[PDB]
Design a protein around this ligand. Sequence first.
Ligand code: HEM
Ligand code: HEM
Ligand code: HEM
Ligand code: HEM
Lengths: 146, 146, 141, 141
Amino acid sequence: VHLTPVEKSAVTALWGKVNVDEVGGEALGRLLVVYPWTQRFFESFGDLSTPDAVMGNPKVKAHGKKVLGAFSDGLAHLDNLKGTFATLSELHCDKLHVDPENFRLLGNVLVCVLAHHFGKEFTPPVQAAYQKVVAGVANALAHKYH
Amino acid sequence: VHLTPVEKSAVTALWGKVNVDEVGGEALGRLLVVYPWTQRFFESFGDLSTPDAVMGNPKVKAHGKKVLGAFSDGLAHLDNLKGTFATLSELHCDKLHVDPENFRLLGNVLVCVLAHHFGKEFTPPVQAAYQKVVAGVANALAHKYH
Amino acid sequence: VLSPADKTNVKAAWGKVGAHAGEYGAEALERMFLSFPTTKTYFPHFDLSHGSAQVKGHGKKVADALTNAVAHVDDMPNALSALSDLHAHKLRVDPVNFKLLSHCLLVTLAAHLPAEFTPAVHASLDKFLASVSTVLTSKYR
Amino acid sequence: VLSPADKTNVKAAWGKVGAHAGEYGAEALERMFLSFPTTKTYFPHFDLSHGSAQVKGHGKKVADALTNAVAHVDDMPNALSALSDLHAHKLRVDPVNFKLLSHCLLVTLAAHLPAEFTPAVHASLDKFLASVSTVLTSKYR
Ligand code: HEM
Ligand code: HEM
Ligand code: HEM
Ligand code: HEM
């Protein structure tokens, strides 16, 4: 878990066409609807009783946007992600209690949004860069557990 | 890998005592048998049709030591296992073709043989550090696949 | 279990597949290998360059597989009966890739349906490749 | 798929645990929290202090439903269906964790059943172990 500038660049350069906000209330969005026990965390939120409910909830578009803005920024510090979210991870660990296998289930429910949103440009190979980046964030998201 | 002072210490002390072509033919003896599918790498090999055909197989008996004196010499470059296990990683994958969950499979295996070779001696943070330890061990011979 | 909610849902994006079928199966297998590289372990004598004629029939070959499964979704385990026997004794692929080939399908799957891919839908879908993948992992041990 | 032989093997080994069971259920997990700290994410309200009273009933509770699956090997969905409805529905334990804990259990019998715990017995047991996080996974749609 080191990325390559070839790749490393697919991430951060195709990222570019990304509108954060609708990318997050959906990724954020398909998690809670595809891995139902991530619900775990938000009965705080309202009706998460249906895809529809789910997915329509502002409280959820609300947090996802917030969850992928913080994202954006870390594609900004790729060389340094552990680097970037430590603070950001103690926090989910120490405080938030999140069962960090939720980082990989979102990286991937989000490889999937990106799937759906970009179509033919989401090539195998940007797909894949896309793939170590979600995995390492996943993993820098994770380094402060104990 | 990232061991501790009283970790490596504990570490270092459980193995003076590991009996190496012993625990050895033992684990790999058991992997073969717990999850019968790693069997795929070894038909040059003879009867694995059985656990006993299996614990008595010599070719296995053999190959197994190989794998732990491989292993006992790395408990020495604890400090940089990515370093000491590079040619080997370089070969599981180029020549060999073994699927890296495997190395993850036998680490768990080697903690149950200790478990059972040692008794209350193997407590939970010594368990905990050899865990930390076969963790880096497989992390380490997968390092370079590609 | 997959619910009948589940069923139609599957039968239905699968219908838009129909016949590109073979091609979602190779682009499949093709991100397979560039993203999860390790899987590659399984095909030491397969030509896996972009375009391999091998990968290609692999995929009509992987796909035809799932059409079978789908057309059979209730009879799922006698369905794939025989293949079941097949990766468990013949190739004895670790189990962990299953979960790996399932996801990237999803994604071509994914990325091929602009419209077709309700998460309503998308969940139905992760969901049938896991039984689909459970069937198959069924005679391992 | 529990075989028959699988089956009297789980039964003579659970057998011998006779009574340390909720003693083995607390070491189980004592283990779980120090070899894999993630799992503790799920136990934020416990005193998970070594020898903590907290984990000592859990454990106990925690080996009872196992001894009861041991006893219904033949009907477990049922057996544990009640249990199956809590895990999936209130708890929302990541099924990923099921494997750690079963990791850990194997692993306490190892050091308490010097030779009841055959290689043919760990085999037998991993799969019991196995069979057991499925059913508890199942509720999980
Ligand atoms: C990229 C993967 C994730 C990233 C980058 C991320 C990032 C963030 C950031 C920047 C915050 C703001 C917290 C703060 O400073 O106040 C946050 C909060 C939060 N996130 Fe994480 N998160 C991720 C995954 C998840 C998952 C998987 C869950 C549960 C599935 C989760 C649940 C939360 C919760 C519950 C909060 C606090 C909100 C409150 O009081 O409303 N996050 N996340
Ligand atoms: C961390 C776990 C493992 C270690 C440390 C390990 C270590 C070794 C070593 C040091 C060798 C010597 C190779 C040479 O350089 O000739 C070797 C050979 C080999 N291993 Fe790896 N091994 C591990 C797991 C496995 C596994 C799981 C398999 C298949 C399950 C495997 C299949 C083979 C084969 C075929 C050989 C060469 C043996 C022969 O040709 O007769 N190894 N292993
Ligand atoms: C959705 C899960 C999967 C399904 C439905 C599936 C389906 C199939 C089907 C029909 C066949 C051909 C058997 C025959 O010749 O009659 C096949 C062959 C094969 N599969 Fe699976 N497969 C899956 C996952 C995997 C995975 C994850 C691997 C390894 C990562 C794998 C490795 C193979 C191999 C090596 C062959 C044989 C290749 C060659 O023979 O020349 N499959 N699969
Ligand atoms: C074989 C696997 C497991 C079995 C048989 C099992 C069994 C049980 C039983 C019988 C209860 C308590 C409630 C009741 O019936 O009155 C329980 C509670 C619980 N278990 Fe599971 N469990 C297993 C695996 C896990 C895992 C992997 C986790 C992860 C964190 C877990 C977490 C919890 C929590 C949080 C509770 C409630 C403790 C409390 O609620 O205070 N269990 N378990």
